[PDB]
């Protein structure tokens, strides 16, 4: 059944695709977190 192959491709390939597009979303805010942490430490060094 190639239809079940299509469903397996939906579940395996594309349902997991929705997962790690949420993870590259997660990648977006951790880079924003990296900017935040480096920024916050930066005026702390500016203060010193």
């Amino acid at each position: 059944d190639e239809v079940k192959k299509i469903n397996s491709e939906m579940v395996a390939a594309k349902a997991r695709t929705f997962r790690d597009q949420q993870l590259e979303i997660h990648r977006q805010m951790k880079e924003d977190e990296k900017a935040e942490e480096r920024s916050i430490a930066d005026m702390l060094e500016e203060n010193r």
Binding site: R38, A41, D42, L44, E45, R48
Partner: protein, 427 residues
Amino acid sequence: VREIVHIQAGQCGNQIGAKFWEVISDEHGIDPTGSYHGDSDLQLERINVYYNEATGGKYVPRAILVDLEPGTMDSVRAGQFGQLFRPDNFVFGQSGAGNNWAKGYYTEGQELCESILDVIRKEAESCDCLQGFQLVHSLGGGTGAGLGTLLLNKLREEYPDRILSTYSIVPSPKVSDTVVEPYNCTLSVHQLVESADEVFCIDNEALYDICFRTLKLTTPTYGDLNHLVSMVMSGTTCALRFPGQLNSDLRKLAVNLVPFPRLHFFIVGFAPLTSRGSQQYRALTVPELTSQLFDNKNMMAACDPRRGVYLTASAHFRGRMSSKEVDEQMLNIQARNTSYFVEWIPSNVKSAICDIPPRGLKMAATFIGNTTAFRELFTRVDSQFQKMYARRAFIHWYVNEGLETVEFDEARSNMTDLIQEYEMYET
């Protein structure tokens, strides 16, 4: 587990050690009263390396302070962190320094060494796996120069296995501060060569150059001058105290940097350094750190490595960085300037990373190198000593303490052989 005992000798050693303890105490987060008040839990994982615990959450460093004159300690006790040190560990005599190697080594050294050995033996038993001993002293006057050699010899006799490391200050070629420095340095070299496994040499003239070029500090003092030396000591031990992607302790460093037993004298460097008004302009990252570390201007030993050839060298990084970025830097700098490095030892530059950076700095690195440029420093003192000793009657000041003149020739014979050895391994 890999504890460290710290020893400070004389005027120069105590003042350097005072700044040295201030930096580490701030790094771990110890209040001047001696109680922990820090912010991060990572500060308390491995405080046992440098700190002992007293009842009631009070921490006392494993510091042994030695001097022949009382005045230095009065400053040490009166300092901001003077109350932190154990009062009993302050061991001393009641006579002048004498500004003489022979006087310190024979007359008062014998009287003081027995008490100092017992005091150190107390701290030596307060640690399960004491990795090695750390000494801070100068080779100029004779208090640190004379007593430090006797203390280092006794420590080697008692504890041959432990890694003996010293931070020594050499007499400057132009800003020398004693009519008889060449004798003191020449005599001290003989014991330093055979006893200490790892020796780091720092010159005052290089420090004045570095502060005036980079820091742009109009009126430098010893506190600012010793600040930089404090960072070098703190960076070396950072692998033991904090996690890292590639831990590298002292015994790792000794194996890599030392090809042959007598070739163990090293030059150390620190980066980054920036004037207090120029740090706005700088995109401080890994390649920028590599540029500073290998730049000859940052080297706090007054010997240009370019005139000589490079032996094995190592760099330690602090902070968070890509491991690939570090590896590419040591690859590029090693291949770009192949004329500087000896051909028969590839992979000259060893890398190592520690996770936690020092306060404020996003990233920091430390450089330690071994090269034949030290022949220039020994040439300077040899030339001065040769013309100095030609008037053989000035030895009389050391003769009064029991020093026979033949000791001077034998000492020059030994360091001359060291100079010849450094010449031979150039090719």
